[PDB]
Design a protein around this ligand. Structure first.
Ligand SMILES: [Zn+2]
Ligand SMILES: [Zn+2]
Ligand SMILES: [Zn+2]
Ligand SMILES: [Zn+2]
Ligand SMILES: [Zn+2]
Lengths: 303, 379, 154, 379, 379
DNA sequence: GGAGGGGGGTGCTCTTAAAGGGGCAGGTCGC
DNA sequence: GCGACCTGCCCCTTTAAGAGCACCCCCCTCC
């Protein structure tokens, strides 16, 4: 498929071998976070790695991960390799989410710093470069969907920043639940059409007042019959269904911090405390790297 | 046996005067006669410095777990965590079957404080009293073992292995262990301001147990002959014995269901002592305040009559096989009690909201004049 | 000079109260049961009846308008110290009571009584006043209801 | 205090009259007066009818591990097996710090008998006596905790929990847990005829400890002086103390290297006490015979003075933190004892081939005329 | 500075027995046993017959702006005014630095009563006791002067002169002067019924000072040791020293903001005497009534225990560096306390509304049973 | 000398009802 | 058709007032 776990496993193995060689040549005592008394070492196999070792091991890869040529990986392919690692972990029974689990916060920070000042490359003769990261890549790796509270919250950001074209972090932050409205707007032309979509005003500062054109000033999502698992309307409806009743009807913030503890039959997944600015920026920095979103925003702003 | 209303010594061909609690020497302060000293000793047992390891260059998860209860130990292989606990309780009830069940429930309660619904294996420590006639030991220990095993069966685990030793006082206890994935349990350090505290079992079990011993001694009985009669004391004894023998498996299940942040078991010390212990673990600056105190019927008055012996009001009274002290948001807690009270899965059991999580201090306290909720005698 | 604590119960029927000391038993018996008396408030239209002599002195405060208690913060005048103590809770922002079902915190039991209506609890209450069937939980609450409402007057 | 060679009560602001062993009624039988009743109770608590499950229509490995000790419990994840042991004892040695090491070694002794070399976690139980003076407790208990933690460090394990209780006699113990793959432990049921049993530590520590305790009082010491000199106790006591503080970890590793068919721990029931138990679980029709008892220096003669209080010759002499009993083949035993005597790193110790193995009924037996070897003390 | 740590005589080459307070005959009635007579003398020196000047055929402010303190004395140039004050207190705290700060604060407090928040110049009167040895004089006096200058710096003024004289007792004081426009000071002669008095500092500083000096006299301590523990006395002394060493700049600044009618200070004569003096000044016919009396924690108990020595409940206990008795309207007072507790500039402190203003005959009283408010030792 | 009884008055905690301000929800008039 | 304005009714909170106990103060006392 789009995402290959073997590549991530190989990169992790190479880094682990190099780090083990460095540690053994330094021959400095260092104790692992495991219960048994043993010298700290990064397992050559991902699965056996402890919860803490993966975090520290993953954090350093952002600075020491090499390739056959020896050139440091570019940010996009590095993010792709981390996604491959996550796919490998999911395949072999590990349930940890390296991008959302609270125990993996530092890895997110280092990845955000690496991806902070990245820009698309026009280096190839073609004027548009296709990023390795793709929409189908994140979907396959269970980054996007209704699996966990954090992934769902990320999914809304993905579709919000694609359709509403809210590339900037401030555009997202200004968003609030009250401003977003859902209208069936059922068309009598098609019986039982059951059209549904959410509209949001765009922050276009113009001297003229009033609604010049309904479509020009607003962006509306659309149902996806190709897969019910991907319909932005369905996910948005499921998002509200799993949020506290108090927050609905509030005009302060749209995104809510996930609950650290959730169950499949839990009525509520989200707290009443909006996500922090740093977390918002960290999530955004990763979403822009996608190829589909990147080209969508490139076309929108240019036109 | 469970079906029989009570353990009658004559039926088993033992002397009528025989009392299981006779071997132990009950004290007003319970098994925890020193509170600060035993607390410091327990902290010293868990005291460890090399585990900081430069904090592992970040917010490393604590191998100590809660620090004071149900330590979680990461494993080399599988990315799993070992979660095991241990607790020992001397006999305090006259029915050996029920007392063994109580010991098993007390041992398992610590796991349920971290939302570990299912247990892997359980060990048993069976102390044998020196001052016990050989004939008696052959009629009581089988009952205690059977109760322990039945409780283990009710908890989805089997008691295999253990140890048997001789001690002046009968010692009952064990070790409950579970090898579980990270998402299976709840680390109690996520409490935030605005939350509420939920208690799954009423307080005042120690008073009810102790008073039943005074029902025979005319010297001690006269000190409370006015405040509390005898039939209500017997009812409170029956209810405390039945309450101490339940299991918090449903509590753990609803804990996972309803977005719980932190929890702890009210076993030994007291509700206030355990609340103070819990507050220290919180990452944030949150201080607990306890407004209510569910106490068995006609037990607060006995505490007042007995003076400093018990001290229910101050929350320092020891408890055995006590309930959980969860920390849920308001709406989840409101739904929590409704579901546990009348669940379709099993039998109904009440739960009360007793406090509010205040911000700033990382300390626990009880308002100067707490309200007493006299738990109805199962009517 | 505090004597050691002993508990003695008023053996008279209808009074199951237990007192903190034998000393207080004589006072309880004399002032409550044995001393059967009736007084009338001097106010022209009060028409109330108080058997004790202590109660009348308090009642005189109600008819007059002498306010000798001043709040520290808002300088508001109150007729009794405990009324001020309840008032100060507004300025300190403390809510001691708390409902045991939905975790709803209030400042006074009057607010809590209102909240219990949502969590309908009068069903499990057994006590009630004979006149208007108030459906209280405890006993002395019926006495308080008979005092504030259904007052005993001429 | 680790470097200190002995316990100096005067050095801790304590009167010389203080003795750690003073808090326990040391009987010749040791911890448990009965063995038939205690064995029956342990078998009762290690027996579960639902456990058999018609052998799962196959050859299911026992869930009780050795059957009598160190139970192995299959897990849901990855085919791992949870192996854990529990053992509690009372002080028998005056030195506090060395007592903690002995207690730690006792808990792990069962674990090493299954072949497990490395341990994950180790809880502990600290029984603080109510008779102990407040001033002593704040200074004596920390010595036990520190020694126990040091022993855990020696064992490559960390103490990350436990429990504290009040008990007329100081109670020390803990539970050690190891989650290991099937190729990391040895099930002791493969013994075959034509093998030899190897005991890795000298027998008869209880005799030395008890007589050393009698040293002070002259009522009993008068008769013991006739059979042995006083100065023998001082060195014998030190040897027993030191032999009860060295872990069998090295011996555990050599079982893997030398095709150890079975092994056990000599503690509590005695060398003949565990010989029968180890035999009853062998799936092959075999019997053990002990042709040699390597008694501690002159302890065999001392046992002759007291007719039955010790009973070493019959083999039912209680031992604390005793060595293993490995049923290697004849060829392996030759190199096994040599290897443990002169390890590459050092710290070797002598191991004695107590006897042999012959086919027949599943029972153990000490020959009618056992030989005695007096181990040479090291100084 | 001595703010970092308590003044230790040894650190400055002074003997342990040394105490600064030894150079004054402290008494419960303060530095003036016949308070009434000193009032007569102060009136005698203030009163001047020529100042009436036939009323100048009009109604204008008097030279003695209020006839009791902080004379205004209008000048010639620019129609300005010269508000000037003086005060002298003998040492009452062991710390020399804090004592100098207290003297400076007391000197400045008179101006802040009139709403003046700026001081152009200040003088200092430093008196050295005859009994003090030479070695002490050069070690304590520099600290006193440093504290005085530090206090002056915080007040936006500088000590630029003074005088030094020999005295049997240490005499510490100064004189504050300010030349201000007619609209920069509140002349405390306005007062209307309906206003509410406001106090900025708790009373009972003299009691705390006296008790702290009774911790060395065995005869006096035993009389009072029953009612108050030593820790309470220590914390009360610390709070009183911190309060007495605090400037009223914020209160004076807020006086203008919240439309203050009249104000004074509680330095000497107690709360009742100063209110009585203030009442006479009011143009209207208004009499004050004081219902609340904020006192330092536990000092009231000592005050009543000692007998007719302090009489805080009678509002006669003398105070040093006391607060301001500000007359404000009801809503302004409600706001006044809120802002002074958490100022925008920060470093707020609590204030109380201690009474009301009613139509009368220019007098002040205290209700029969004042509601004593125990101010806690915050931080 | 004296601890114990009698008589009186009082603060404190609890309880209930009454008063009151805020806010949701009608009917009427104007645009 | 939509809104502003007046008014009515309910909700929830705060103030006002009674009940009774524990307590102190004073006085008297006959042993
Ligand atoms: Zn009565
Ligand atoms: Zn009246
Ligand atoms: Zn107020
Ligand atoms: Zn409620
Ligand atoms: Zn009624």
């Amino acid at each position: 498929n789009s995402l290959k776990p073997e590549e991530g496993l190989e990169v992790w193995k190479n880094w682990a071998q190099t780090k083990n060689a460095e540690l053994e040549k330094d021959a400095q005592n260092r104790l692992a976070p495991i219960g048994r008394r043993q010298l700290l070492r990064f397992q050559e196999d991902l699965i056996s790695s402890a919860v803490a070792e993966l975090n520290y091991g993953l954090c350093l890869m952002t600075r020491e991960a090499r390739n056959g040529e020896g050139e440091p990986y570019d940010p996009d392919v590095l993010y792709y390799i981390f996604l491959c690692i996550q796919k490998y972990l999911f395949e072999n029974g590990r349930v940890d989410d390296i991008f959302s689990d609270l125990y993996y916060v530092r890895f997110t920070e280092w990845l955000h710093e690496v991806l902070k000042d990245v820009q698309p490359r026009v280096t190839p003769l073609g004027y548009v470069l296709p990023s390795h990261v793709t929409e189908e890549m994140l979907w396959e790796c269970k980054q996007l969907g209704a699996h966990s509270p954090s992934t769902l919250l990320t999914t809304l950001m993905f579709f919000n920043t694609k359709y509403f074209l809210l590339k900037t972090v401030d555009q997202h932050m200004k968003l609030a639940f009250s401003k977003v409205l859902r209208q069936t707007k059922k068309n009598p032309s098609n019986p039982k059409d059951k059209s549904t979509s959410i509209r949001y005003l765009k922050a276009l500062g113009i001297h003229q007042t009033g609604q010049k054109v309904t479509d020009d000033m607003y962006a509306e999502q659309t149902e996806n019959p190709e897969n019910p698992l991907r319909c932005p309307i369905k996910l948005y409806d499921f998002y509200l269904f799993k949020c506290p009743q108090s927050v609905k009807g509030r005009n302060d913030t749209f995104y809510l911090t996930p609950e650290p503890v959730v169950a499949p039959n839990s009525p509520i997944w989200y707290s009443v405390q909006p996500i922090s600015r740093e977390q918002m920026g960290q999530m955004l920095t990763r979403i822009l790297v996608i190829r589909e979103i990147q080209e969508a925003i490139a076309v929108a702003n240019a036109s | 046996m469970s079906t029989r209303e009570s353990f009658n010594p004559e039926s088993y061909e033992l002397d009528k005067s025989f009392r299981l609690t006779r071997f132990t020497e009950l004290k007003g302060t319970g098994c925890k006669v020193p509170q600060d000293v035993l607390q410091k000793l327990l902290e010293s047992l868990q005291e460890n410095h090399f585990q900081e390891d430069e904090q592992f260059l970040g917010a490393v998860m604590p191998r100590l777990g809660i620090g004071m209860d149900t330590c979680v130990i990461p494993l080399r292989h599988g990315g799993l965590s070992l979660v095991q606990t241990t607790d020992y309780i001397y006999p305090i009830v006259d029915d050996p079957y029920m007392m063994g069940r109580i010991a098993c429930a007390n041992v398992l309660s610590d796991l349920y404080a971290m939302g570990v619904t299912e247990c892997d294996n359980m060990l048993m420590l069976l102390g044998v009293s020196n001052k016990m006639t050989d004939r008696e030991r052959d009629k009581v220990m089988p009952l205690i073992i059977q109760g322990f095993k039945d409780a283990a069966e009710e908890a989805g685990t089997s008691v295999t292995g253990g140890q048997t030793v001789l001690n002046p006082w009968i010692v009952l206890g064990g070790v409950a262990t579970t090898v579980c994935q990270p998402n299976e349990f709840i680390m109690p350090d996520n409490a935030v301001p605005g939350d509420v505290l939920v208690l799954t079992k009423p307080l005042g079990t120690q008073v009810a147990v102790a008073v039943h011993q005074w029902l025979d001694i005319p010297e001690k009985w006269n000190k409370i002959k006015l405040v509390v009669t005898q039939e209500d004391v017997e009812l409170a004894y029956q209810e405390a014995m039945m309450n101490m023998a339940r299991l918090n498996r449903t509590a753990a299940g609803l804990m996972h269901t309803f977005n719980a942040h932190a929890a702890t078991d009210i076993t030994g010390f007291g509700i206030l002592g355990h609340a103070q212990n819990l507050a220290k673990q919180q990452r944030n600056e949150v201080s607990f305040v306890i407004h209510n105190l569910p106490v068995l019927a006609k037990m607060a008055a006995v505490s007042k009559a007995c003076g400093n012996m018990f001290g229910l009001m101050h929350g320092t009274c020891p408890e055995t096989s006590g309930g959980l002290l969860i920390c849920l948001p308001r709406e989840q807690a409101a739904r929590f009690c409704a579901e546990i009270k009348s669940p379709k899965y099993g039998e109904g059991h009440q739960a009360w909201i007793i406090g509010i999580v205040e911000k700033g201090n990382r300390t626990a306290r009880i308002i100067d004049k707490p309200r007493i909720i006299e738990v109805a005698p199962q009517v | 000079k505090k004597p050691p604590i002993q508990y003695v119960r008023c053996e008279m029927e209808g009074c199951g109260t237990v007192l903190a000391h034998p000393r207080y038993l004589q006072h309880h018996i004399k002032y409550q049961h044995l001393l059967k008396k009736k007084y009338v408030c001097p106010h022209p239209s009060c028409g109330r009846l108080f058997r004790l002599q202590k109660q009348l002195l308090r009642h005189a405060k109600h008819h007059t308008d002498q306010r000798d208690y001043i709040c520290e913060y808002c300088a508001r005048a109150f007729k009794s110290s405990h009324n001020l103590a309840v008032h100060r809770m507004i300025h300190t922002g403390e809510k001691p009571l708390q409902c045991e079902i939905c975790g709803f915190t209030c400042r006074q039991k009057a607010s809590l009584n209102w909240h219990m209506k949502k969590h309908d609890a009068d069903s499990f209450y057994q006590f009630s006043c004979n006149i208007c069937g108030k459906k209280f939980e405890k006993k002395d609450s019926v006495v308080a209801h008979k005092a504030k409402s259904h007052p005993e007057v001429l």
